[PDB]
Amino acid sequence: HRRIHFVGIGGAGMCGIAEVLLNLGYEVSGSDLKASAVTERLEKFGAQIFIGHQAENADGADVLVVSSAINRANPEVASALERRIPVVPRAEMLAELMRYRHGIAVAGTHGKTTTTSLIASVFAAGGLDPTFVIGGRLNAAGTNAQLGASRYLVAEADESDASFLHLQPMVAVVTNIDADHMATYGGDFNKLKKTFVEFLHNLPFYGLAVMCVDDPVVREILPQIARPTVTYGLSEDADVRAINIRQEGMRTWFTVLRPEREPLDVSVNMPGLHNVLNSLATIVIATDEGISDEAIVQGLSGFQ
Ligand SMILES: Cn1nc(Nc2nc(N[C@@H](CO)c3ccccc3)nc3[nH]ncc23)cc1C(C)(C)C
Ligand SMILES: [Cl-]
Numbered sequence: 001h002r003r004i005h006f007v008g009i010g011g012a013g014m015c016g017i018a019e020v021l022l023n024l025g026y027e028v029s030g031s032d033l034k035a036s037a038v039t040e041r042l043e044k045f046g047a048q049i050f051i052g053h054q055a056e057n058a059d060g061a062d063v064l065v066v067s068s069a070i071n072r073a074n075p076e077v078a079s080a081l082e083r084r085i086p087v088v089p090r091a092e093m094l095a096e097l098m099r100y101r102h103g104i105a106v107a108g109t110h111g112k113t114t115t116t117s118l119i120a121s122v123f124a125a126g127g128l129d130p131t132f133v134i135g136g137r138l139n140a141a142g143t144n145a146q147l148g149a150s151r152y153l154v155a156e157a158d159e160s161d162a163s164f165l166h167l168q169p170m171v172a173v174v175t176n177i178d179a180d181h182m183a184t185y186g187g188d189f190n191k192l193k194k195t196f197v198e199f200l201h202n203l204p205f206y207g208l209a210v211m212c213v214d215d216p217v218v219r220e221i222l223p224q225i226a227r228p229t230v231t232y233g234l235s236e237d238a239d240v241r242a243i244n245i246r247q248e249g250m251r252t253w254f255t256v257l258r259p260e261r262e263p264l265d266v267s268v269n270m271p272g273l274h275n276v277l278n279s280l281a282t283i284v285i286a287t288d289e290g291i292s293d294e295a296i297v298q299g300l301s302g303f304q
């Protein structure tokens with residue numbers, strides 16, 4: 001399959017996915033109701049844009065991507081369904097971009113967005129210009145370059161998303177396991193816990209699981225993970241730990257301890273132990289990736 005057609009390509013979760021597919025070398029087409037600067041940029045990058053939804057727009061396409069559910073009202077979708085052209089939801093296409101890059105999946109019930117942003121900030125301070133996904137929207141710091149150009153893709157992994165168990169990361173964080181999305185799993189918390197184990201087991205044997213052991217449920221499933229693991233938290237037995245937490249204004253300072261490394265003083269410009277924890281998760285991923293202490297310190301403290 002080589003040509004991908006987006007129905008409603010100007011949509012805010014859609015243009016980013018189309019841009020990354022352009023960057024990967026695919027043929028990309030899309031349709032929208034009104035021309036925009038979004039569809040202008042995509043056309044500049046090689047996308048064939050159609051204005052208005054007519055079934056002839058889906059000709060040549062090997063797969064269709066749609067904004068929400070398969071609403072067969074739209075003629076392009078109906079024409080693809082008739083020809084047995086697969087129609088995948090936006091979130092599934094987004095999730096599969098990780099197979100082409102060194103993917104860092106940030107899972108957990110709370111803190112996915114801030115941790116994803118802190119990781120992106122540290123990797124960028126290291127010159128790695130990563131593409132990152134928060135709230136289904138693809139981002140990167142350097143405006144002019146195409147999304148997906150970087151080796152690295154950092155994405156939120158939401159346990160209530162249909163594509164949760166189809167991410168293929170190299171590294172996965174689990175910040176915490178709460179019951180917010182029990183309904184996704186038949187209102188059963190034990191089923192939810194087992195899904196996070198299944199998720200971590202989608203890492204390859206050379207992958208890395210980053211586990212917050214201050215959360216009691218993360219700590220509970222830890223011995224089930226048959227993948228390389230680094231634990232973090234304020235707990236005294238964690239591999240990567242924060243001590244001597246203090247404040248100077250709205251900035252939090254602390255010392256991070258790491259195996260086989262000297263203590264490193266670090267600050268973040270957000271209050272609360274939950275942001276100390278977001279930073280520790282970041283420090284673990286950046287350390288394992290080989291990023292310098294200077295880029296770690298600059299990425300964390302320069303984060304707005
Ligand atoms: C922006 N943000 N970032 C969060 N990050 C994390 N939260 C927790 N636990 C949460 C709840 O369990 C928590 C809340 C308060 C203090 C300590 C822990 N554990 C984590 N481990 N690593 C990262 C991380 C949480 C938040 C909210 C939305 C709750 C303000
Ligand atoms: Cl289908």
